[PDB]
Design a protein around this nucleic acid. Structure first.
Ligand code: NA
Ligand code: NA
Ligand SMILES: [Zn+2]
Ligand SMILES: [Zn+2]
Length: 327
DNA sequence: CATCTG
DNA sequence: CAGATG
């Protein structure tokens, strides 16, 4: 957790590049298991050989560790940190809609910077376009103070549209979080469910309203259950306009909301622990539902939930306010 | 995993 | 339809 940090950190630096710059997915995968195990390892690795002793740890990675220990750096790491091409992919990626694949091709066409992009706006697609347009704003954290005003608006309009709507602002913001990165709203209607055959209007109506009154600015992707968009808090008394914020809204069958609600709220850490216990208590838990573990190995059948209250109870646990859902 | 591009 | 991105 700090006894083998530098070690894992470089391993990450290495794994990462294999993946994004080279295509070396395996390679990349290697650095990762390695970093995984060395992370868990209870002692302070004083040598490659000692390391190698580990599973996931081979000869090359050992090699690397020695050099790292032996001297405060790594030639290769240093060699990679310079190279403009590598640095490029790393940069270009920062733009919503640019993944590595794309990051690659652009560089290969000379697009390396931000302007590069701008001039080649033709080569970007819609998402990518928006992405570039909101580059800075997109990287801006969202103060909870904005989060509330924001949440305010969604919740009202979702409301005027259908009284039976049920919206929820999951995420960190939910676990108290002083600031978040984006805004994910969990959504369900009573007339939407597990067997219930679709209902796209269900999602499409609210999206409209939002854009209707201006809260929603752009659409990134708009499927029948997931809408990926951009939004923004009406600039007040002209002087202070807000940034453009990421926003997702997603429809869920009412019959498996709280699993999802719970689920989204995290932290992953809380989740695991809750997953690990549910299991003790003789259960199963996931994004969608909670089921009773049979002894034959496994087995299923959905347990019936009406609130985060129903889940905890089940695995017989202390209901945890979302504030203390941390770990 | 759901959505887009092509 | 494979393959990308979030
Ligand atoms: Na990106
Ligand atoms: Na293939
Ligand atoms: Zn020891
Ligand atoms: Zn999100």
């Amino acid at each position: 957790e700090t006894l083998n940090g530098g070690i894992t950190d470089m391993l990450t630096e290495l794994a990462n590049f294999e993946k994004n710059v080279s295509q070396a997915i395996h390679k990349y995968n290697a650095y990762r298991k390695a970093a995984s195990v060395i992370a868990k390892y209870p002692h302070k690795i004083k040598s490659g050989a000692e390391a190698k002793k580990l599973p996931g740890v081979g000869t090359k990675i050992a090699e690397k560790i020695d050099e790292f220990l032996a001297t405060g750096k790594l030639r290769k790491l240093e060699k990679i940190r310079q190279d403009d091409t590598s640095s490029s992919i790393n940069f270009l990626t920062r733009v919503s809609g640019i993944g590595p694949s794309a990051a690659r091709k652009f560089v290969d066409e000379g697009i390396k910077t931000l302007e590069d992009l701008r001039k080649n706006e033709d080569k970007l697609n819609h998402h990518q376009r928006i992405g570039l347009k909101y580059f800075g704003d997109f990287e801006k954290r969202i103060p909870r103070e904005e989060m509330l005003q924001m949440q305010d608006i969604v919740l009202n309009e979702v409301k005027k549209v259908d009284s039976e709507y049920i919206a929820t602002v999951c995420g960190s913001f939910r676990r108290g979080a002083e600031s978040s990165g984006d805004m994910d709203v969990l959504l369900t209607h009573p007339s939407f469910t597990s067997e219930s055959t679709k209902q796209p209007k269900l999602l499409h109506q609210v999206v409209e309203q939002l854009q209707k009154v201006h809260f929603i600015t752009d659409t990134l992707s708009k499927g029948e259950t997931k809408f990926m968009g951009v939004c923004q808090l009406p600039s007040k008394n002209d002087e202070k306009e807000y940034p453009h914020r990421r926003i997702d809204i997603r429809l869920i069958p009412k019959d498996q909301y709280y699993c999802g609600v719970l689920y989204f709220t995290g932290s992953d850490i809380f989740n695991k622990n809750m997953r690990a216990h549910a299991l003790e208590k003789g259960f199963t838990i996931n994004e969608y539902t909670i089921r009773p573990l049979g002894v034959t190995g496994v087995a299923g059948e959905p347990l019936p939930v009406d609130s985060e209250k129903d889940i905890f109870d089940y695995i017989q646990w202390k209901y945890r306010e979302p504030k203390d859902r941390s770990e």
